């Protein structure tokens, strides 16, 4: 049938990478992964996660007593202070996790966008955008031509006189 890109849905057949390609020509179909955009997305998330596994050096000692209870007026100032600080660290934990979930989702959504305008400026006038995340190449691009878009070695002037006859005239 037909193939669609990242605008419609995500592929469940991509297992060796986060982002990848999927071509369709006369030789058949094909699916590859993008190692440079997957590594760039993971390097920002474990760097984000390296910020959270660093432990404090401030040692807190014991001021209450679980066996022999402290005096009641000093036992209520300690209890009121500890619940005040607990509200702060429960707010800051729930705020930080919810904020870094918005940043994680948005950074992986901008790596797929950055891969999209990289291919779009490679295929300068030889391809048109479908609207679902795919490019309609207007020349006979075989299996090593499709490899040249994948590894950033495409030359648009090799097919420029051929793909322009198929766009404005045919």
């Amino acid at each position, epitope marked *: 049938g037909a193939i669609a890109g990242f605008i419609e849905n995500g592929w469940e057949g991509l*297992i*060796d*990478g986060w982002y990848g390609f999927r071509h369709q020509n006369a030789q058949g179909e094909g699916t590859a*992964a993008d*190692y*440079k955009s*997957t*590594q*760039s997305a*993971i390097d920002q*998330i*474990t760097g984000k*996660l*390296n910020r*959270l*596994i*660093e432990k404090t050096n401030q040692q807190f000692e014991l001021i209450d007593n679980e066996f022999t209870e402290v005096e009641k007026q000093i036992g209520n100032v300690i209890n009121w202070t500890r619940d005040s600080i607990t509200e702060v660290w429960s707010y800051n934990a729930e705020l930080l996790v919810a904020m870094e979930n918005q940043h994680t989702i948005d950074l992986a959504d901008s790596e797929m966008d950055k891969l999209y305008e990289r291919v779009k400026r490679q295929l300068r006038e030889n391809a048109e955008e479908d609207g679902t995340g795919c490019f309609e190449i207007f020349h006979k691009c075989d299996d090593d031509c499709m490899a040249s878009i994948r590894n950033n070695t495409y030359d648009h002037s090799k097919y420029r006189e051929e793909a322009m006859q198929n766009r404005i005239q045919i």
Partner: antibody
Framework: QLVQSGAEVKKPGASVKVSCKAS????????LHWVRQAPGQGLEWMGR????????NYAQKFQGRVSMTRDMSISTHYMELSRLTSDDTAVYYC????????????????????WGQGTTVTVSS | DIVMTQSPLSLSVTPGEPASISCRSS???????????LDWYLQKPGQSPQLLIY???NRASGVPDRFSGSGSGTDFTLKISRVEAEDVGIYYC???????????FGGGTKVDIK
């Protein structure tokens, strides 16, 4: 694959500079590590450099007297260790990540996979 | 300040009987992404070190199926299903959890044929 420079004999107080030419790397955004192995003792991690930016992370033992640079046009890394003593007699390895591996778990690996042949450095009189 | 402690510090083996090298950590090596940052290395006499296990349990490229890795948290074991004559040398464990502390190696474990 990595290829280092030859052996060097130095005097206490001078500075040694080792080369490491990463030949065949299309990513150049991994981490390259320099480690050290004295004769008889075990391996000893010196530092780590990012070829994209140049950001280094030395050990606390080798802090102050280690400078690591790179030249990405010729794809060659350097390591300079100043104020040498007799206990700097060792073999100096440069190592990095292999690349072109089709596993999902290999993206979370930041250590040493492919290694250099070693550089013997002798400091005596 | 993560300190790696290896054992049994020497291991005379027989070519056909399994072996096991353990390396226990001081702090937990389990990251937030769910991986244990422990690497197993083999250095033969005169050669560069060879990577065997790279994230606690995952075998490298040119490593046979004799070498296995298990363990999580602080306690880790390298496991050889059967020993050949090409499996002698010194085995180091190496942690890579946090880089501003740094990467550190184990003490080593000499393995010779008995």
């Amino acid at each position: 694959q990595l290829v280092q420079s030859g052996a060097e004999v130095k005097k206490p107080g001078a500075s040694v500079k080792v080369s490491c030419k990463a030949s065949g790397y299309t990513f150049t955004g991994y981490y390259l590590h320099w480690v050290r192995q004295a004769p008889g003792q075990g391996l000893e991690w010196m530092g780590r450099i990012n070829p994209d930016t140049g950001g280094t992370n030395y050990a606390q033992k080798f802090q102050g007297r280690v400078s690591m640079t790179r030249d990405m046009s010729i794809s060659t890394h350097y390591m300079e260790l100043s104020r040498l003593t007799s206990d700097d007699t060792a073999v100096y390895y440069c190592a990095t990540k292999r690349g072109a591996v089709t596993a999902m778990v290999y993206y979370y690996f930041y250590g040493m996979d492919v290694w250099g042949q070693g550089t013997t450095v002798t400091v005596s009189s | 300040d993560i300190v790696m402690t290896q054992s049994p510090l020497s291991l005379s083996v027989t070519p056909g009987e399994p072996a096991s090298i353990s390396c226990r950590s001081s702090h937990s090596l389990l990251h937030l992404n769910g991986y244990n940052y422990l690497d197993w290395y083999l250095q033969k006499p005169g050669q560069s070190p060879q990577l065997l296990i790279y994230l606690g349990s995952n075998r490298a490229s040119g490593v046979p199926d004799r070498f296995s890795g298990s363990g999580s948290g602080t306690d880790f074991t390298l496991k050889i299903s059967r020993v050949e004559a090409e499996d002698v040398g010194i085995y180091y464990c190496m942690q890579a959890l946090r880089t501003p502390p740094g990467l550190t190696f184990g003490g080593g474990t000499k393995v010779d044929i008995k």
